[PDB]
């Protein structure tokens, strides 16, 4: 049921009723975004625009043709016009493809959306590519993680996240072709 049409342009009239005319109408974050989800386009062939984001850095806003994401049900490739999805990512390697060239970032988790206008958005919290991570401290960190296991629920959830991330990072450092 859609009997309550909320939104930015519906906020303006109620703001002109209950807030005074001394102030201009406040902005909304949908006024700064040129690209939406249902507004069709952006594919125009075999490429499709990717948006690899961390909270501290924009890693890519180029147009790729193949995106490999580490979903919680396993890895999956995103071609040009994928089905619209909301994929929770586990620790793994995101692989971008421009053709012969590739970017392989190892992420720490986060999400990945594919939208009905063919755009995709990869929303992680820390994405370090594989030359920035050392292979010497990942085994030290897993040995310091998978051995001391507290039976408390919070510490064992942290330990499960630790062994998952460090196992994926150990399986990702030597699996470069």
């Amino acid at each position: 049921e859609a009997a309550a049409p909320a939104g930015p342009k519906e906020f303006t009239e109620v703001w002109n009723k209950k807030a005074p005319s001394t102030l201009i109408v406040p902005e909304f974050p949908s006024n700064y975004t040129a690209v939406k989800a249902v507004g069709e386009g952006q594919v125009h062939g075999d490429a499709f625009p990717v948006n690899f984001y961390t909270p501290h850095s924009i890693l890519s806003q180029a147009q790729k043709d193949t995106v490999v994401l580490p979903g919680v049900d396993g890895y999956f490739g995103v071609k040009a016009s994928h089905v619209p999805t909301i994929a929770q990512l586990k620790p793994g390697v995101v692989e971008l493809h421009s053709g012969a060239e590739s970017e392989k970032f190892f992420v720490s988790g986060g999400f990945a959306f594919v939208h009905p206008n063919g755009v995709t958005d990869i929303c992680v919290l820390e994405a370090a590519t594989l030359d920035q991570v050392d292979p010497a401290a990942v085994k030290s960190a897993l040995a310091a993680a998978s051995a001391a296991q507290p039976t408390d629920e919070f510490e064992q959830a942290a330990n499960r996240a630790a062994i998952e991330l460090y196992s994926a990072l150990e399986s990702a450092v030597e699996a470069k072709a």
Binding site: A19, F28, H56, V114, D121, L125
Partner: protein, 277 residues
């Protein structure tokens, strides 16, 4: 007499030197903390692409946070978003609902605990001392989802430019309370998305809305920090202009007093010498 105006001149002169130093300090802080504001603008795009933007929702509980500043030479920022806070809050409280008002920065706890005092539960400060990080904003969002409202209003000044700061409200609908209801369009608009999570959609939406609150809260306080620096850069220019204008008038006043002083002392000496000679 004539020494108090000279010490007041010496006061306003180094007040003008102070404010001219503070303008360039705030300008360098605006230049350094602009690239982080430009980087953090990316991650707020896919969540308003996915969840939309619905400010005027009818809710049962709403945590409204007004992201103010820490130090207060910003000159019309922390009161302007207090005005915008009450202007966007009177718009969206006509359902008989509860409203929690929060302030990030301790120049908002001085301006919000007298206009809406009994609905003020939380005051956050010191978030700009070292820097703004995502773990800090995630902890602040964790104390925001201590209580479970149906909406999260974020009041902050969007750093549009070094001249213009548009105050921006951003809303986060909590998942099963409002987000699964505010997306129904002959069925739903979220059912076009194929959920690829471990558990059900009611939990991946919970994780997505907490992460969206953390993302836009981090971006909100980063934008508000850059607007603080860019408004202090203009307020200290106004203070240099005012303390140069006051100094220019007080210099003329001192010159008039100096001229009158030599004239009256000379007239006293002539009046003494004309009684004897």
């Amino acid at each position: 007499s004539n020494q108090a105006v000279k010490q007041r001149i010496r006061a306003i002169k180094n007040i003008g030197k102070i404010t001219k130093a503070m303008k360039m300090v705030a300008a360098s802080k605006m230049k350094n903390a602009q690239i982080a504001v430009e980087q953090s603008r990316g991650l707020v795009d896919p969540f308003v692409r996915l969840f939309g933007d619905f400010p005027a929702v009818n809710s049962n509980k709403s945590v409204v946070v007004a992201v103010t500043s820490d130090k207060g030479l910003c000159g019309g920022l922390n009161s302007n978003i207090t005005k915008y806070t009450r202007a966007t809050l009177a718009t969206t409280e006509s359902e008989g609902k509860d409203v929690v008002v929060v302030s990030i920065g301790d120049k908002g706890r001085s301006q919000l605990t007298r206009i809406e005092s009994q609905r003020y539960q939380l005051a956050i400060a010191d978030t700009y001392k070292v820097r703004v990080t995502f773990g800090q904003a995630s902890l602040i969002v964790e104390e925001l989802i201590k209580h479970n409202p149906q909406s999260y209003q974020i009041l902050f000044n969007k750093f549009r430019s070094a001249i213009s700061f548009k105050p921006t409200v951003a809303t986060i609908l909590s998942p099963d309370l409002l987000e699964k209801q505010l997306e129904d369009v002959t069925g739903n608009s979220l059912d076009a998305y194929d959920i690829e999570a471990s558990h059900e959609r009611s939990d991946v939406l919970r994780d997505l809305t907490e992460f969206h609150l953390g993302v836009t809260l981090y971006n909100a306080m980063l934008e508000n920090n850059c607007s603080e620096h860019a408004s202090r850069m203009s307020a200290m220019e106004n203070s240099t202009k005012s303390a140069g204008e006051m100094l220019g008038k007080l210099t003329l006043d001192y010159n008039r007093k100096r001229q009158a002083t030599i004239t009256t002392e000379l007239i006293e000496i002539i009046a003494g010498a004309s009684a004897l000679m």
